[PDB]
Design a protein around this ligand. Structure first.
Ligand SMILES: *[C@@H]1O[C@H](CO)[C@@H](O[C@@H]2O[C@H](CO)[C@@H](O[C@H]3O[C@H](CO)[C@@H](O)[C@H](O)[C@@H]3O)[C@H](O)[C@H]2NC(C)=O)[C@H](O)[C@H]1NC(C)=O
Ligand SMILES: *[C@@H]1O[C@H](CO)[C@@H](O[C@@H]2O[C@H](CO)[C@@H](O[C@H]3O[C@H](CO)[C@@H](O)[C@H](O)[C@@H]3O)[C@H](O)[C@H]2NC(C)=O)[C@H](O)[C@H]1NC(C)=O
Ligand SMILES: *[C@@H]1O[C@H](CO)[C@@H](O[C@@H]2O[C@H](CO)[C@@H](O[C@H]3O[C@H](CO)[C@@H](O)[C@H](O)[C@@H]3O)[C@H](O)[C@H]2NC(C)=O)[C@H](O)[C@H]1NC(C)=O
Ligand SMILES: *[C@@H]1O[C@H](CO)[C@@H](O[C@@H]2O[C@H](CO)[C@@H](O)[C@H](O)[C@H]2NC(C)=O)[C@H](O)[C@H]1NC(C)=O
Ligand SMILES: *[C@@H]1O[C@H](CO)[C@@H](O[C@@H]2O[C@H](CO)[C@@H](O)[C@H](O)[C@H]2NC(C)=O)[C@H](O)[C@H]1NC(C)=O
Ligand SMILES: *[C@@H]1O[C@H](CO)[C@@H](O[C@@H]2O[C@H](CO)[C@@H](O)[C@H](O)[C@H]2NC(C)=O)[C@H](O)[C@H]1NC(C)=O
Ligand SMILES: [C]C(=O)[N][C]1[C]([O])[C][C@]([O+]#[C-])(C([O])=O)O[C]1[C]([O])[C]([O])[C][O]
Ligand SMILES: [C]C(=O)[N][C]1[C]([O])[C][C@]([O+]#[C-])(C([O])=O)O[C]1[C]([O])[C]([O])[C][O]
Ligand SMILES: [C]C(=O)[N][C]1[C]([O])[C][C@]([O+]#[C-])(C([O])=O)O[C]1[C]([O])[C]([O])[C][O]
Ligand code: NAG
Ligand code: NAG
Ligand code: NAG
Ligand code: NAG
Ligand code: NAG
Ligand code: NAG
Ligand code: NAG
Ligand code: NAG
Ligand code: NAG
Ligand code: NAG
Ligand code: NAG
Ligand code: NAG
Ligand code: NAG
Ligand code: NAG
Ligand code: NAG
Lengths: 490, 490, 490
C-alpha cells in the first residue's frame, strides 16, 4: 500500500483478421473490410440505365430491319444487350467493318429512323424473298428497298437526297451479289456494274460480284452492307445500273453515353449502377474481379480476388498483477479501443478513454469515406473478347487492356499496403500519445514500470485515478508524499 | 523566483492554406504551392520550336501544292499548326487514309521536294483547270502533273524512276475520276482502265470510276490521292492508259521530333517550351489541366484542376504565462520556424533556432526541386479529337488516352497526399527533436511541464538561457541548486 | 569509479552505398542491391521455351513452303526467331496485311499442315518456276498449287471443301498477277477475271492485275497471298476462271502462348526464362532496361538504368570515452547490427544485441522476398519496332508502349524511394527501441547522457552489465546505492 498502479492499454478481440502492410506480409488486426467485389447477383438490373435486350436480334439485325426485330423500331438505349443465341433470319448479308458499324450505332444509342421519298423512277421497288418472311409473307429488311428492273429495263440511277437538317444523317445501304448470271439478268435486265454513293466529302464505289457462295438459309447470293454519314449542307448521291439495295431514309445519329454488351444474364426488375456481362454488381467497393467488361459507375477491374483494408488496430492476445499495452492487449476492454486499468486502495478497475478511441475511429472512417461508394462512371469503351482471329488490331486492343489491368492491379496492391501501414501507425500512435500524456501529468509522482504502467508513489483512490483519466490531476498536491516514498532508503 | 521557464515552439501565420494528406482530407499549413497548371497566355510562342502556321492551308494542301499554299514550298517545322478556317481551293480531291498521310508528313517535318524528269513521251503534260487558279490563270496542284491525250492518242505508259540516293523518297500521285464518259474520252481518248504503281516491294492498283459526285467548287469529278515510299536501290514503276495524275518528283522523308496540331491560337513573339491548342503554357509545374494535346517539354495532363503541395508545417493558432508547442503555435515568431521562449530574472524573451528551421526548409526545397521545372518532352503522339465518326480505331485511340489520363491523375493524387504527409511529418519531427535535445541538455535540472516547456529549477539568467540555446549549457554547474529546489519539502 | 557507462549503438561499414529515399536524394546506407537488370549474356537460351530459329526463313516463307524452308514443315514453337538476314527465294509475292498473318500464325505456334484432295478437274496442276528451285529442279511453294490450262482450256472452277472436323482450318491461297497479256493467255488460255473464295460467313473477291512490276529475282509478275479461316460445320468454296494459286490443304490453328521475335542473337544451350532480342536475361530483378521487347517470365521494362534498394541502415562514420549512436556509428561492431558498449570496473566491452539485429534483417529479407524472383510471364504482345512508315496504326502502337513504359518507370521510382525510406525508418526504429528498453530497465539508477549512453550510478560489473543486456537486471537491488550517488551534494 501507500502506492497505486495505473496501466494504459488497448482492446483485443478473439476473432482478428489478417491483412498486409508495408512492414508485414501478414499481420492480424481487430477488423478489416473487403475492397474487391467478387460476386454478382447474376442478373442485369433494368434500372437506372435504359436497357434494350436484343433477344434473338443483334443490333445490326435490328438496324437493317430483320422482321423478327420489328419490335425494336425507333427504340433508344443506354445499354443494348446482345445475346449469344441471336441469329439472322432474313437475306444473308455481310458488313465490311461490321465491328465499326456496330460500335458507332451502339454509341449513338438510337434506332430512330426517318423515311425519305427517293426518286426511283423507272425501276420496280420493294423486292421480297422467301428467305425473309414477315407474317408468313415473302418480305425484306424493313429499312432497305430492293430495286429490280421495270419492264425489262433498269435505267441508270442518279438520285440525290440533300441534308437540309441541322443534324447528321446515317444512311445504310447495300449491294446485291447474285448467285448466277441468270439471276443478274432476271433481276436487273443487264450485266452487273459498279455502284457509287457519294457526298461532297466522300465517295464509296462497290462492285457487285456474281457467284455462288455456300447456301445460307438456302440462299447462295449475298448482300454487302455499307454506310454513309451525311452532314448538314451536304448531299447524298446514289449512282447505279443495278444490284442496289437502296436506303428508305436515314437513322438519326446522336452522341452520348450509350454502349452495347454481350451477355446471357437475365434482365431483372432491380436497381444497380454497375453492369457487367455476369450481371449487375454492387459498387460500394473500389475494385472488382468479376469482369473487365463494365458499364456505368463501376469498381475498377483488378486481378486480385481479395484485398483487405484494416479497420482496426493490431490484434494482440492477453498475456495470462495488472499490465499495460507492452506486448499485451485487453480482451475485456469492450467499451473503448484504448483505456486505463488501475489498482489502488479501493480495488482494480478499468475505464475506456473516449478521446483516443474516437480519434482512431474518425481517421479510419475518413479513409473508408475515400474508398467506399466513390466509383466513377465509364460508358462505351473497346471490345475485350473476340470470336474471330484478326491479328494486328486485336493484338493491340488486347495489349491495351492487359496493360491497364496490370497497372490498376499494382495501384490497388500498393494502396492497400500503404493504407494498412498507416492504420497500424495511427492506432499505435494513439496508444503512445495516451501513455505520454499520462506520464506528463504525473510529473515526479510516478515511475514507468516498463510494461505500459506507472507506479504512482502515493495513495491514489478512485477519485484520484479519475482525476488522472480526466486530465485534472494536480501533481503538486501529492508531490511531497510521492517524493518521500520514491527517494526513501529501504 | 529561483526558477526559470523555457518553452519550445514553432511559428504560425495568420493566412494559412488547406492541403490534403494521407491522414487528413483537409489540414491547414503555413504555405503551399500549386502543382497543376490551369491557365495559358492564349498564344502559341514562336520560340524555341520552329512553328509553321498553315493559315488557310492544311498540311495536305501544302503538300499537293494548292496555289494559295505556294509560300510553303520546301519549308520545315517542329510543329505545323492547322487552323479551323483552312480550306482547299484547287481540284476537289480525297485521300484514302488521309489521317495516315497527314501523320507521316507531319512527323517527317519537311516539305522538301526534288523535281525529277519523268519520261512522259506521247501524252500532253501540265493540264490545268479553272477550279485551281494561280495568279488568275487556270492551273493545277504544283507537285502534280495532269497528263492528257496527245493528238487523240494516249499510249500505254510504263515509266520508271530508280532511287539511286541513300535516302527514302516519298511519291504523291493521283487518279482522276471524271464526271462523265464524255470527259473520259475528251481527256484520255479511250475508256478508263486501271493504274498500277509498283516497286520491288509493293504494288498499288487503282481503278478510275467515272461518275458525277456532288459539285464542289462547281466540279463533279474527283482526284483520289495515293502515296508510295521508295527505298534506296528500289525503283518506282508507273503503268497507266489514262486518268493518271503524275508526280513531278519526290518529297524527302525525314525522321525526328516534328508534329502537327489543330489550333486557332495566334502565334506570338515569345519563348515557351510547352505548346497546347489553347496556347503555350508555363512548364514549371509537374501537372496541367489545360489540354490533353501537348507538344514539347510539358507538364502531364491530369483531371484535377488544383493540387496543393504543402511548403510549410501545420498552421496552429496561438492560445490566448508563456507556453510551448503543445496545441499552440507562435504568430510572433517571424525570424524562424522553430525557437525558444523563456522567462527568467531578466524578463521574457524569444529566439529562433536556426538549425531546426534550416533543416525543415532544406527538405522542403529538396522536394520542390524534384517536382518543379522537371517536365519531360513529348512530340508526335496520337490524335485526341475527331471531326468524324469512325468506330473501332477511334474507340481504341480514345480509350488509350482516357486510360493514360486516369492513371496519371491517380499518380498525381497519391503523390501529393504522400508528399504532404511527409512534410507534416518532417516538420513535426524537427519540433520534437528540438524539444528532446533540450530535455537531454537539462538532465536533472528541469522538469517537463507538459505544455512544451521546461521548469528549470535554478536561477537561469539571459546568458544561461543562451547557453541552452547554443548547446553549451553545463548541467553540472547548476545541479546542486536544481536538486535542492526540486526535491524540497513544501 | 562508483559508476559505469552503458552505450547503445549500431554498426557502420567502410564501403557504404548511396540510395534515394523520400527524405533524401542521396543517403549512404551500409548495403544495397540493384533492381534494374541491365546486361544480357547476348545469347537466346534454348531452354525452357521451345525455340524455332528461322535462319534464312521468315515465318511467312516457312508457311508458304519456300524450298529453303522445307525443314520447318509441321514444326511448333513457343518462340519463332526471325533473323535480319532472312530472304525469300521463291516466286515473288506480297501479303496484303502481312503483319496480321504473321501475327496470327506466330500466336498459333504451329506449322502443322494437313493435305486435302481438292477436285481440280479440267486444269493442269503443279506449275513450277526457275525462280523457285528445289534440289536444282524448277519447283514452287510446297503448300500451294499453281493451276494452269489443260489442252488450252481453263474451265470455270467451283470447288468445295467442307470442314467436318471439330477444329478450325486456316487456308492460305493466292492470286497470280502475270507480267503481260501473253503470259495470261499462255498460262490460263483466256483473259483474267476475278477470284472469289467464300464460306457461309465470309467472302473475299480478288482481281488479278496484269502488268510488269520491277523484276525481283528476274520475275516481273507477282503472287498476292490471302487467307481464310473455316469453322467446323462451314465450307470453303473456291470460284475462279484463272490466276488461282490454290491451297493443297489447311494449317491447324491453335491457341496458346506462342510468339515471334526479331533477333540476331545466337541460340545457346542454356536455360533462362526471359528472352529479349539482345539475348536471354536473368529474371531475379523486378525491372530491366535491356529491351522493351520480351518473352517469358521477365522483369518489367523501365527507362532507369539503375535503381538501388537499401538492404541496410544509414551508414554513419565513427567520431574520433565510449559513445553511443547519437551522430555516431561503430565500425568495430562486426557481429551484429546493434549492440552495447560499456565501461565499468573491469574494462571497456562490446556485445551485439541479437534480437534487434535479427528484427531488422528479417524485415529487409521480407521486402527482398517480394521483389526478387517474382516476375510475371507475358507472351505474344504488340510489335514495338517497325521497318516501314505507316502512320495512324503505328502511331497508336508506339504511343501505347511509350505510355506503358513511362507509367512503369514512375511506379519503379516511387516504389524504391518508399521502400528505402521504410528501411531507413525501420532500422532507425530498432535502434530507438533498444535504447528505450534499456532506459526502462534502469529506472532511477541511471541518467541519459545525451550521446546514446547511460551513466549508471552504481558499481556495475561484467555480470551486472550482462544482466541489463539479457533483460534480467533488477533495479531494486541497486536503487539505494544509485539514489545516494545521484542525489548527493558535491
Ligand atoms: C458451285 O458449287 C456449289 C457446291 O457444290 C453449288 O452449291 C450447291 O448447289 C446444290 C444444287 O443446287 C445444292 O443442293 C440442293 O439440292 C436440291 C436441288 O433440287 C435442293 O432441293 C436442296 O435443298 C439442296 O440444298 C447445295 O446446297 C449447294 N451447296 C452449297 C455448299 O451451297 C453451287 O450451286 C455451284 N455453283 C454453280 C454456279 O454451279
Ligand atoms: C446526276 O445528278 C446530279 C444531281 O442532280 C447532277 O448534278 C447537278 O447538275 C446540275 C446541272 O448541270 C447542276 O446545276 C447547275 O445548273 C447550271 C447549268 O447551266 C449551272 O450554271 C449552275 O452552276 C448549276 O450548278 C447541279 O449543281 C448539280 N448538282 C449537284 C449536287 O452536283 C449530275 O449532273 C447528274 N449526272 C449526270 C451524269 O446526269
Ligand atoms: C515496263 O518497263 C520496265 C522497266 O523499263 C520493263 O522492265 C525491264 O525489262 C527489261 C527487258 O526485258 C529488263 O532487262 C533485261 O534485259 C535482258 C533481256 O535480254 C535480260 O537478259 C536481263 O536479265 C535484263 O534484266 C529489265 O530488268 C526490266 N526492268 C525492271 C525494273 O524490271 C518492262 O519490261 C516493261 N513492261 C512492258 C510490258 O514492256
Ligand atoms: C450514273 O448515272 C449517270 C446518269 O444517269 C449514268 O450516265 C449514263 O448512263 C447511260 C447508260 O449507261 C448512258 O447511255 C449515258 O450516255 C450516260 N451518261 C449520261 C450523261 O447520261 C451512269 O451510267 C451512272 N453510273 C453508274 C456507275 O451507274
Ligand atoms: C502497262 O504498260 C504496258 C507496256 O506499255 C502495256 O502493255 C500493252 O499495252 C498496249 C495497249 O493496251 C498493247 O497493245 C500491248 O500489246 C501491251 N503489251 C505490251 C508488251 O506492250 C499495259 O497496257 C500497261 N498496263 C496498264 C494497266 O496500263
Ligand atoms: C464460278 O463457277 C461457276 C460455275 O462453274 C461459273 O459459272 C459459269 O461459267 C461459265 C464460263 O464462264 C459459263 O459458261 C456458265 O454459263 C456460268 N454459269 C453456270 C451456272 O455454270 C462462274 O464463272 C465462276 N465464277 C468466277 C468468278 O470464276
Ligand atoms: C426481288 C425478287 O426478284 N425476288 C424474287 C422472289 O419474289 C421469289 C424468289 O423465288 C425464286 C424468292 O423468294 O427467292 O426469287 C426472288 C429473286 O428473283 C431471286 O431469288 C434472286 O436470286
Ligand atoms: C486538263 C484539261 O483538259 N483541262 C480542261 C481545262 O483546260 C478547261 C476546262 O473547261 C471546261 C476547265 O478549266 O475546267 O476543262 C478542263 C477539262 O477538260 C475538264 O474540266 C475535265 O472534266
Ligand atoms: C506454270 C508455268 O507455266 N511455268 C513456266 C515454267 O515451266 C517455265 C518458265 O520459263 C519461262 C519459268 O520457269 O519461268 O515459265 C513459267 C511460266 O509459264 C511463266 O514464267 C509465267 O510468267
Ligand atoms: C468492421 O469494419 C467495418 C467497416 O468500418 C464495419 O462496418 C463493421 O461494423 C466492423 N465490424 C466489427 C465487428 O466491428
Ligand atoms: C427466339 O428464337 C427462338 C428459337 O427459334 C424462339 O423459340 C423464341 O421464341 C424466340 N424468342 C423471341 C423473344 O422472339
Ligand atoms: C426522277 O428522275 C427522273 C429521271 O432522271 C427525272 O426525269 C424526274 O425529274 C424525277 N422525278 C420526279 C417526280 O421528280
Ligand atoms: C464472369 O464471367 C466471366 C466471363 O465468362 C468469367 O470468366 C468469370 O469467372 C465470371 N465471374 C463471376 C463472379 O461470375
Ligand atoms: C510559399 O512557398 C513557395 C515555394 O517555396 C515560396 O516560393 C513562397 O515564397 C512561399 N510564400 C511565403 C509567403 O513564404
Ligand atoms: C485566307 O482566306 C481568307 C478568306 O478568303 C482571306 O480573306 C485571307 O486573306 C486569307 N489569308 C491568307 C493569310 O492568305
Ligand atoms: C520514253 O519512253 C518511250 C516509249 O516507251 C521510249 O521509247 C523512250 O526510250 C523514252 N524516251 C527517252 C527520251 O528516254
Ligand atoms: C483549352 O481548350 C480546350 C479544348 O477546346 C477546352 O476544353 C479547355 O477548357 C481550354 N482550357 C483553357 C485553360 O483555356
Ligand atoms: C548486401 O545485400 C544483399 C541482399 O541482401 C546480400 O545478398 C549481400 O550479401 C549483402 N552484402 C554484404 C556485404 O553484406
Ligand atoms: C542461308 O543463306 C546464306 C546465304 O546464301 C548461306 O550461305 C547459308 O548457308 C544459309 N544458311 C542456312 C542455315 O541455310
Ligand atoms: C470435279 O468437278 C467436276 C466438274 O464440276 C465434276 O463434274 C465432278 O463431279 C468432280 N470430280 C470428282 C472426281 O468428284
Ligand atoms: C539491346 O538491343 C537494343 C535494340 O537494338 C539496344 O538499343 C540496347 O542498347 C541493347 N541493350 C543491351 C544491354 O545490349
Ligand atoms: C413499297 O413501295 C410501294 C410502291 O411500290 C409503296 O406504295 C409502299 O408503301 C412500300 N411499302 C410496301 C410494304 O410495299
Ligand atoms: C510543264 O511541262 C512543260 C512541258 O509541256 C515544261 O516546259 C514546263 O516547265 C512545265 N511547267 C509549266 C508551269 O508549264
Ligand atoms: C502434284 O500433283 C500431281 C498430279 O499432277 C500428283 O501426282 C503429285 O503427287 C503432286 N506433287 C508433285 C510434287 O508433283
Amino acid at each position: 500500500n501507500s502506492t497505486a498502479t495505473l496501466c494504459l492499454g488497448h482492446h483485443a478481440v478473439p476473432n482478428g483478421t489478417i491483412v498486409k502492410t508495408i512492414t508485414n506480409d501478414q499481420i492480424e488486426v481487430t477488423n478489416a473490410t473487403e475492397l474487391v467485389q467478387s460476386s454478382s447477383t447474376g442478373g442485369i438490373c433494368d434500372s437506372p440505365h435504359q436497357i434494350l435486350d436484343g433477344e434473338n436480334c443483334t443490333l445490326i439485325d435490328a438496324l437493317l430491319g430483320d422482321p423478327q426485330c420489328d419490335g425494336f423500331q425507333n427504340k433508344k438505349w443506354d445499354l443494348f444487350v446482345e445475346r449469344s443465341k441471336a441469329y439472322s433470319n432474313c437475306y444473308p448479308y455481310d458488313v465490311p467493318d461490321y465491328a465499326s458499324l456496330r460500335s458507332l450505332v451502339a454509341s449513338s444509342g438510337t434506332l430512330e429512323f426517318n423515311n425519305e421519298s427517293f426518286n426511283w423512277t423507272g425501276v420496280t421497288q420493294n423486292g421480297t424473298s422467301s428467305a425473309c418472311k414477315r407474317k408468313s409473307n415473302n418480305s425484306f429488311f424493313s429499312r432497305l428497298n430492293w430495286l429490280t428492273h421495270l419492264k425489262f429495263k433498269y435505267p441508270a440511277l442518279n438520285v440525290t437526297m440533300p441534308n437540309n437538317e441541322k443534324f447528321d444523317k446515317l444512311y445504310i445501304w447495300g449491294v446485291h451479289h447474285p448467285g448466277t448470271d441468270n439471276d443478274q439478268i432476271f433481276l436487273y435486265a443487264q450485266a452487273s456494274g459498279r455502284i457509287t454513293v457519294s457526298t461532297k466529302r466522300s465517295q464509296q464505289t462497290v462492285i457487285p460480284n456474281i457467284g455462288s457462295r455456300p447456301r445460307v438459309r438456302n440462299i447462295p447470293s449475298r448482300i454487302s452492307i455499307y454506310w454513309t454519314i451525311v452532314k448538314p449542307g451536304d448531299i447524298l448521291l446514289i449512282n447505279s445500273t443495278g444490284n442496289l439495295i437502296a436506303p428508305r431514309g436515314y437513322f438519326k445519329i446522336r452522341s452520348g453515353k450509350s454502349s452495347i454488351m454481350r451477355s446471357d444474364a437475365p434482365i431483372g426488375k432491380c436497381n444497380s449502377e454497375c453492369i457487367t456481362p455476369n450481371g449487375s454488381i454492387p459498387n460500394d467497393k473500389p475494385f472488382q474481379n468479376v469482369n473487365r467488361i463494365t458499364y456505368g459507375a463501376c469498381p475498377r477491374y483488378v486481378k486480385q480476388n481479395t484485398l483487405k483494408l484494416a479497420t482496426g488496430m493490431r490484434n494482440v492476445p492477453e498475456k495470462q498483477a495488472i499490465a499495460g499495452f507492452i506486448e499485451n492487449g485487453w480482451e475485456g476492454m469492450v467499451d473503448g479501443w484504448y483505456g486505463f486499468r488501475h489498482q489502488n486502495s479501493e480495488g482494480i478497475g478499468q475505464a475506456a478513454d473516449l478521446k483516443s478511441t474516437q480519434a482512431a475511429i474518425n481517421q479510419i472512417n475518413g479513409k473508408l469515406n475515400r474508398l467506399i461508394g466513390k466509383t466513377n462512371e465509364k460508358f462505351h469503351q473497346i471490345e475485350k473478347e473476340f470470336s474471330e482471329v484478326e491479328g494486328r488490331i486485336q493484338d493491340l486492343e488486347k495489349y491495351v487492356e492487359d496493360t491497364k489491368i496490370d497497372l490498376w492491379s499494382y495501384n490497388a496492391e500498393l494502396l492497400v499496403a500503404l493504407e494498412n501501414q498507416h492504420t497500424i501507425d495511427l492506432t499505435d500512435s494513439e496508444m503512445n500519445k495516451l501513455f505520454e500524456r499520462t506520464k506528463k501529468q504525473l510529473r515526479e509522482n510516478a515511475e514507468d514500470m516498463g510494461n505500459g504502467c506507472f507506479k504512482i508513489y502515493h495513495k491514489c483512490d478512485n477519485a484520484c485515478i479519475g482525476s488522472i483519466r480526466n486530465g485534472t490531476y494536480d501533481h503538486d498536491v501529492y508531490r511531497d508524499e510521492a517524493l518521500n516514498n520514491r527517494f526513501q532508503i529501504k
